[PDB]
Ligand code: HEM
């Protein structure tokens with residue numbers, strides 16, 4: 134059967150079949166259903182082996198020209214591998230496939246039309262935190278590409294017993310430090326207060342700035358994490374300026390060009406990769422609305438309002454809506470001016486709609502979390518708002534993890 | 545136990561207990577879980593009687609000063625009533641309580657801080673469509689109050705066997721007609737195309753305008769529906785003007801002052817009221833963003849853009865965000881100028897947050913559908929966006945219904 138899905142803007146109807154391949158608390162950010170926690174022992178054969186077979190089938194079934202001999206031979210090899218060793222190793226080709234599929238299956242990602250365009254750095258041979266650091270640097274460097282942003286993923290060694298996990302303690306590859314000031318005030322990124330403390334506690338020298346790039350906190354083979362400063366030549370920044378307001382530059386705002394997730398787990402055919410940093414390119418509203426205007430972040434709304442000469446004390450004036458748009462054009466303008474890849478939320482919405490349509494035609498569905506896909510600003514002025522969606526967990530998938538410091542056994 | 549809920553903007557944590565009193569497909573507009581369909585026979589005693597007792601307990605348990613004698617006597621009376629007659633009648637006091645509770649339990653309503661402030665018109669003695677019409681007129685008149693908008697509800701007779709249902713075939717008490725033009729174009733409200741046809745098909749004279757107020761299509765005691773024109777002196781309208789753009793008036797826009805839902809079903813202690821029109825007052829973004837800017841409605845965005853002299857062909861310019869805000873200030877300004885109650889989305893968001901906080905303190909929860917509660921524009925600039933919510937069906941509740949024309953047996 135199917136689930137009937139309606140696009141209220143265009144009246145269009147779609148039939149979801151794909152939800153049958155799946156594995157209200159919808160407005161929860163980090164639900165347990167979206168988390169893949171730690172392990173003390175390897176995954177039971179009873180659950181590993183069927184998952185593995187399904188992946189191999191999915192992998193071979195994706196081929197335009199089917200190769201039955203290779204498929205059955207690989208099915209045989211993998212089965213024998215799991216039954217005798219208690220685990221298995223993917224081929225590079227299978228890993229590349231897994232990373233794209235997991236992105237294709239990320240319900241919270243608006244940039245999925247790009248799913249097939251991903252550079253994969255195989256770091257499964259990695260053994261030390263220094264080698265992890267080198268892989269992360271190469272990733273930052275490749276992905277940054279002097280502002281011509283490229284989507285990439287670095288896949289570190291898979292979880293074995295769960296006592297030898299490779300982990301990136303950071304939220305993101307590039308992110309700013311947040312300090313609780315003696316004044317009671319907060320400096321920089323209020324969202325990294327706890328993690329900034331962790332870095333300081335592990336020997337990081339805090340420069341006490343508003344835009345201090347946090348260090349890499351790398352855990353290799355279950356060992357205690359090691360702190361590494363990101364070479365500043367690798368961190369590309371965009372200084373904020375408005376195309377009409379000269380005073381915008383005076384706010385002294387900047388942002389990093391690279392949106393890279395550092396802390397997620399890639400699940401593929403029973404295998405778990407607890408260290409697999411990935412990136413795309415920015416969507417303007419993420420910096421302009423979330424990073425600059427949330428009270429839990431840089432919180433600049435009032436200042437941009439006052440400087441525009443608006444009624445900052447009457448909500449009914451819509452000064453907040455007026456200010457947010459200027460911040461958003463500034464973000465867009467600044468990235469454009471400085472030759473750095475950025476996408477506006479309107480263009481992204483249309484792109485996702487095209488992708489979703491392609492996905493229903495290609496496989497009878499697209500897992501999509503409406504709450505995440507709808508831009509944080511101008512919702513209904515956007516096609517995705519009027520689109521009914523089905524949110525489900527397929528495989529391969531990118532899961533959240535429990536924060537490493539909460540489960541790590543020290544030395 | 546409880547469910548831990550986080551407000552990411554203020555870091556605040558709440559514990560939901562109330563979800564235990566309840567009865568992903570979250571982005572679906574009219575799910576079956578939110579619908580209460582028709583009946584051929586009265587509700588089985590096995591399901592009616594326990595629901596009835598729970599309501600009586602809830603009603604008596606709401607008293608500041610408990611009345612055990614009255615409670616047990618009413619429990620006894622109701623039980624005897626259901627066991628012997630197969631149904632029961634609420635007291636006016638119980639009905640008033642039920643209507644407010646159902647509003648308090650409406651997860652999709654941002655105006656809930658007002659839940660206790662509701663005028664209840666008891667029309668349970670109604671027998672004809674002409675009497676229904678008189679009750680609706682009195683409601684429109686009371687609620688309108690010359691622009692000083694008051695929340696009201698008219699409760700028509702409860703469902704008996706389901707073959708004698710009282711129904712309002714309209715979506716809303718006041719709404720504009722939508723016509724498919726010979727030109728292939730659409731005139732007026734594109735969202736009422738099908739229902740406008742139904743009215744024409746039932747003998748309504750279409751005036752072929754952009755703002756033609758639809759007639760009342762009233763079904764009393766299971767009879768065939770009757771068409772009634774709303775007395776125009778009862779329909780208060782706000783003509784749209786911008787406080788700075790003189791050309792805004794030239795767009796020739798207007799909207800009705802009264803947001804009144806006509807088609808929902810009130811469920812209370814096993815009883816179903818399939819005709820119970822209710823209203824509040826407008827939240828600006830509903831007219832400005834949804835009614836004026838959706839492609840499925842009045843679709844004015846491009847015209848407001850051009851007239852502002854903007855890059856209507858480059859999405860990256862953020863012309864849509866620029867235009868929507870002006871439309872929104874126009875809506876707000878026009879209702880203010882014309883002394884008609886309206887609430888901006890920023891003020892409404894703050895109000896709901898205060899309400900939600902009061903609700904967790906008062907009963908350990910607040911059923912809330914995030915997708916609906918977050919304004920259609922300026923999401924994150926709003927406190928409700930950062931609030932994690934739990935969506936569940938309590939009782940009393942306002943359910944959707946299957947469109948009457950789809951199930952009605954004609955004469
Ligand atoms: C190439 C351009 C891309 C764009 C414009 C894009 C954009 C986004 C945006 C806007 C979000 C919402 C993030 C948030 O609010 O926290 C997101 C989330 C996500 N994206 Fe993409 N994305 C892109 C590429 C990628 C890539 C390359 C992958 C993986 C290989 C990916 C995986 C995800 C995942 C897993 C999430 C959810 C993250 C979370 O739950 O915190 N995206 N993406």
Ligand code: HEM
Nearest residue numbers: 647650652653654655658695696822823824825826827942
């Ligand atoms: C007094 C001021 C009020 C405000 C500002 C308010 C505002 C709203 C808004 C903005 C919505 C979203 C509607 C949509 O997008 O379709 C809504 C939905 C709702 N409200 Fe309220 N409301 C108010 C009063 C009421 C009253 C008096 C009741 C019932 C007695 C009520 C019952 C509901 C219900 C049941 C829904 C969901 C309607 C649907 O699912 O289509 N509201 N309200």
Ligand SMILES: N#Cc1ccc(Cl)cc1O[C@H](CCN)c1ccccc1
Nearest residue numbers: 305392393394412413414415416419
């Ligand atoms: N915009 C954007 C975006 C693009 C790709 C990816 Cl992986 C994530 C993205 O956004 C998220 C926003 C989380 N606050 C993000 C994640 C990691 C680094 C920087 C930004």
Ligand SMILES: N#Cc1ccc(Cl)cc1O[C@H](CCN)c1ccccc1
Nearest residue numbers: 716803804805823824825826827830
């Ligand atoms: N705004 C608003 C609003 C206030 C109270 C109620 Cl009952 C409903 C409201 O909005 C809905 C929007 C549906 N498109 C509404 C329902 C019925 C008539 C007019 C407006």
Ligand SMILES: C[C@H](O)[C@H](O)[C@H]1CNc2nc(N)[nH]c(=O)c2N1
Nearest residue numbers: 518519520521571572573915916
């Ligand atoms: C698909 C999605 O459910 C739909 O388009 C929703 C989104 N949020 C909404 N929120 C409100 N208040 N009213 C609506 O009609 C909608 N439409």
Ligand SMILES: C[C@H](O)[C@H](O)[C@H]1CNc2nc(N)[nH]c(=O)c2N1
Nearest residue numbers: 160161162504505929930931932
């Ligand atoms: C409570 C709610 O889940 C939360 O505040 C969400 C809303 N939608 C979002 N959408 C995206 N892309 N990113 C987010 O962080 C959030 N935050």
